[PDB]
Structure 1
Amino acid sequence: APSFPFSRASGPEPPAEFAKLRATNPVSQVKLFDGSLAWLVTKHKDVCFVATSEKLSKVRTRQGFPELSASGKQAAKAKPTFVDMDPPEHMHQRSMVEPTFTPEAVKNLQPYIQRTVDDLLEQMKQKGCANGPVDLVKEFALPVPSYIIYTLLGVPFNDLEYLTQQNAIRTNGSSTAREASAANQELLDYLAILVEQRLVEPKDDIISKLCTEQVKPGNIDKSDAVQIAFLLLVAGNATMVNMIALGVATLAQHPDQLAQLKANPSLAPQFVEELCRYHTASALAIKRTAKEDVMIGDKLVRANEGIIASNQSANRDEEVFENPDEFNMNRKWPPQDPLGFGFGDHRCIAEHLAKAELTTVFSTLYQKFPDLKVAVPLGKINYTPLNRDVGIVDLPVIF
C-alpha cells in the first residue's frame, strides 16, 4: 500500500496517482504516517457517498480515525467543536454560528466585502511598484480574507494587521514549531480576552452572538466560544489566501481567459466556480471512520477502518466533468456539484462567503490593475511544498 498523502505531480497539479486509481482501483488502501492502513476513495460518486453515509463518523476518538500527521493525533485529544462532530451534536453547535454565513447574510455583507477589496487594492496602488515587484500575497491575498473574518468575529480595526501577521506565521512553511505555536497561543489568548469583553458589553459580531445567545444561557461556556471562534478563523483563512493567489497565477497561464475576464468582469462567478473545481486547495478534510461494515464500490470497509475521500480527485473525475484537466471557465456544468467545499452535512459553512470574496476579487482586480502581470517566469512560481495542499507562498507582481 502506497504512503499517503501523495505528493503533487508538479507545482500546480494534483497527485498523479489519482488519475490512475480512478481508472483501475477507485477504492484502495493507503498507508498512513503511523503505519496504519486507510481506504482512499477517488471517484465523485463515492466521495459523495462517504460524505453523506450515516454509517461513517467524524468523531476523532473513534478507533481507526485516519490522522495524517502526529500533530493531528494529539489535536484529537482536545474537546471537539462541530467540525469533528456527528449528528445530532454537529448541527446543534453549527447552527449557533450558521446565521452569519447564509446566502442572505452574505448578500448583505457584499458592500463591506467590496469596500475591503477596494481599500486594499487602493493601498497597493499607492504603495506602487516603482522599486521592484510587490508580493500580491502579502499585499492583498492575505489581508482580504483575514480582515473580513476578523471583522466578522469582532476584532477592532486597529488590531487587524498584527493578528493577520500572527495567523500567517501559524501556517508559514518556514516557521519553526516554536514560532508557529507561539503565534497560535497569541491568537487563542486574544480571542479569550475578546470573549470576556463581549460577555460584558456585546456588540454586533459573531463572538457577541455566541456570548449572548449561548454562553450566558449556559448552552456552552466561554472556553467553547473561544474554540468556535478559533475554528472559524483558522479553518479557511490560509485556503482563501491560496485561492486568490492561485486564481491570479491560473489567469497568467491562460491568457485567452484573462482577456475574456478583462472585457467582461461579469464572468467572475464562472471563473470562480472553475477555479474551485480545478484547484482543490483543501483536499484532505473529508475523513471518516466506519461505525459499521460498509460497502463502497467493490470493497468492503470494515467497522473501525478509516476512509479518506479525495474531493480533489473527484473534481477531476472524467465520468462527471468532461476534459477535467483543462481549465475552462466557459465549461458547461453537469448536474453534479463540484466538491471544492465538500458535501453533505459538513459542507463548508463559509461556501457562500468564500465565493463572494473570490467573485469580488476577480471582478475588481483587473479593472483596478488592467496591466497586472506576474513578475517572475510562470515556471518559477513559488508553490507550496508538493506534500501539502496546493497553494502559492508568494507571488511577485508588477502593474
Structure 2
Amino acid sequence: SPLEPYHIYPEAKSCPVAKVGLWNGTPAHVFSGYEDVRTVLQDRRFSSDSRRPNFTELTPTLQSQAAAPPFVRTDNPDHRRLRGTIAREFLPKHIELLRPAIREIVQGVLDGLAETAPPQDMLEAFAVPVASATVFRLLGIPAEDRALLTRCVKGVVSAVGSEDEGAEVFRTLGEYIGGLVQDPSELPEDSLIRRLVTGPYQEKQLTFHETIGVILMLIVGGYDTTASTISLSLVSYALQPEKFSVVHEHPERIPLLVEELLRYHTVSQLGLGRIATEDVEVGGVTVRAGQMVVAALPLANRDESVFPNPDELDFDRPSVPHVGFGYGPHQCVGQALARVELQEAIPAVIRRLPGMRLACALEDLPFRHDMATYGIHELPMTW
C-alpha cells in the first residue's frame, strides 16, 4: 500500500516504542506516538549533533557529512547562531510578500502547458518547475546552474547511494556553492544568497564553510519535498477529486486543506534521528545515554488518538497541528514558504485541469521507496 507509511518501520505496528536496526545495524528506539514524538523533539536531552559518538544518520549518504554537517545537525550554540543568519528571511510576514510572485510562477507554468497534449508527467512538468523556480529565485541561483543543483540534490536525498558516493555529491555541491560565497557579484541584489554573503558572512558571524552549509541546506531542503508534496497531493486529487470541492466552494478553507495534505503525505518518511545525551525516560522506555532514537513523523501524523480515522484524507478534520515539519528547535525553517507554495499551486492546477486523472495504474507509479523523502519519480496524468 503506497499511500500508507507503515512499511518503513514495520516493528511499530506492534509497539509505540519499537527497537529497530538502522541502515548500518545501529540499534534505535522508534517512537510512533504523536505525544511521544513531540516530547522527544522538544527535549534538550535528544541531540542533533552528529559529532557525537554513535550518531547515526538514517542514510549512508548523509552519514558522510557527520563530522562537518550543516546546521540541521548541530545543537547550541552553533545551531542558534547559524539558523539565526537566515531566520528573518523565512518569517511568515516576509514570505507572505512573495505570494504574488509565487502565484505568477504557477500561472506561467500552467500557461506553458495550456496547449500541450496529455499525458504529462506532472512532477517534471508542474511540481518541480514551480517549486524549483520559487526557491532558486529566492536564493538568486543563475538559471544556467539549476540543472546541476537538481542532479546534486537527487544524489543527496538518495537512500541507496553509498557513504562514499554521498561524500562525492556533497563535494561537488560544496565546490559550486563556495564559488558564490567567494564571488557573489553576479547574483541579484535582492537575493537571499547575496544578502547572506554581504551581511552575516561579511560581518564575520559565520565562516566561509558554514556559509556553504547554510546555502547547501536551503538548496537540498528547498524544493524537493515541496515538489513531492504537490505531486502526492495530485495523486490524492486523481483518486478522490470530489474531496477537493473545497477549492471551488470554500476557498477560505484552502490553508486547512494544505495542512491535512501535509499530515497525510508526511514526505519525511524515515522520521527524524536524535541521540540521547543522558539516560531519559519517554513513553515508558528508558533511552540510554549515547543511544539513537527515531521520531517517526509519518506515524505520529496518523496516531488515531489524535487524528481519528487517520488513514483517511479528511479536509473537515478538527484542526490539530501535524508534525510533518518536525517540532522544537529544528522545526522546518522553510515551512512558511512551503505552505504558500502548496496553497497557490494545488488549487491553481485543480482549477485549470479539474479532469486530471492518473494516466497509469496506481500500482505502476514509481514511488520514492529508494529516497530519504517520499513522493514519485514520475507522475503520468491525463485530462
Q: CA deviation at 1:98?
A: 1.0
Q: 2:81 aligns with which of 76, 83, 92?
A: 92
Per-residue CA shift, 1:259-307, capped at 9, x if unaligned? Answer: 4434444432222111100111013352111111100122111111111
Which residue pairs with 2:254 in the alignment? 268
Q: 2:341 aligns with which of 345, 351, 357?
A: 357
Does the 8 Å CA contact 1:12/1:383 hold for their aligned counterparts? no
Question: Which residue of 2 is the match for residue 159 of structure 1?
Answer: 144
Cα distance in 2, alignment partners of residues 180 and 73 from structure 1: 8
Indicate the residue corresponding to 1:246 in structure 2.
232
Structure 1 residues 289 and 88, CA, compared in 2 at 3 Å: closer, same or farther? same
Question: How many angstroms apart in 2 are the aligned matches of 1:325 and 1:168?
Answer: 30
Question: Any idea what SS the aligned residue of 1:280 has?
Answer: coil
Partner residue, 1:119: 108
Please give the alpha-carbon distance, in whole angstroms, between the structure 2 residues aligned to 1:27 and 1:106.
37
Picking from 369, 375, 385, the partner of 2:353 is 369
Match of 2:34 in 1: 44
Tell me which residue corresponds to 1:12: 3
Once the two structures are superposed, what CA deviation does each residue of 1:67-89 show, in whole Å capped at 9, x if it has no partner? 33333332212x23221111232
- d(CA) in 1 for partners of 2:215, 2:146: 18
8 A contact 1:289–1:307 mirrored in 2: yes
**1:173 Cα offset (Å):** 6.7
Do residues 304 (structure 1) and 324 (structure 2) align? Answer: no
Task: Summarize the Cα distance change of 1:174–1:70 in structure 2 as closer, same or farther, 3 Å threshold.
Answer: closer
Cα 1:222/1:274, change in 2 over 3 Å: same
Kindly tell me: are residues 324 and 60 of structure 1, through their superposed partners in 2, closer, same or farther at Cα, counting changes over 3 Å? same
Q: TM-score, normalised by structure 1?
A: 0.87
Q: How does 1:1-399 map to 2 (within 5 A)?
A: 10-16=1-7, 21=12, 25-77=15-67, 79-126=68-115, 128-129=116-117, 132-156=118-142, 158-159=143-144, 162-163=147-148, 165-167=150-152, 169-170=154-155, 186-198=172-184, 203-334=189-320, 337-385=321-369, 389-399=373-383
User: Offset at 1:381?
Assistant: 2.4
In 2, are the aligned partners of 1:382 and 1:394 still within 8 Å (CA)? yes
Distance 1:225 1:141 in 2: 28
Aligned partner of 1:191: which letter?
I
| CA deviation map 1:319-378 (0-9, x unaligned) | 1111111111111224xx210100011100011100110010122112222322322233
Q: Distance in 2 between matches of 1:31 and 1:113?
A: 42
Q: Determine the C-alpha separation between the residues in 1 that align with 2:200 and 2:192.
A: 11
Query: 163-172 or 201-210: which moved more?
Result: 163-172
Residue 180 to residue 89, structure 1, CA distance change in 2 (3 Å): closer
TM-aligned CA deviation for residue 170 of structure 1: 2.9
CA contact (8 A) 1:262 1:366 kept: no
Over the aligned positions, Cα root-mean-square deviation in angstroms equals 2.7
| Structure 1: gaps spanning 5 or more residues | 1-9
Other-structure match for 1:6: none
* Whole-angstrom distance in 2 between the partners of 1:71 and 1:267: 39
Q: Residues 80, 180 of structure 1: CA spacing in aligned structure 2 closer, same or farther, 3 A cutoff?
A: closer
Distance 1:174 1:188 in 2: 20
Find the counterpart in structure 2 of residue 7 from structure 1. none
Partner amino acid, structure 2, of 1:287 = G
Report how many residues are paired. 382
For 2:170 and 2:114, the matched residues in 1 are separated by 32
Contact 1:169–1:179 under 8 Å retained in 2: no
Identity, in percent, stands at 30
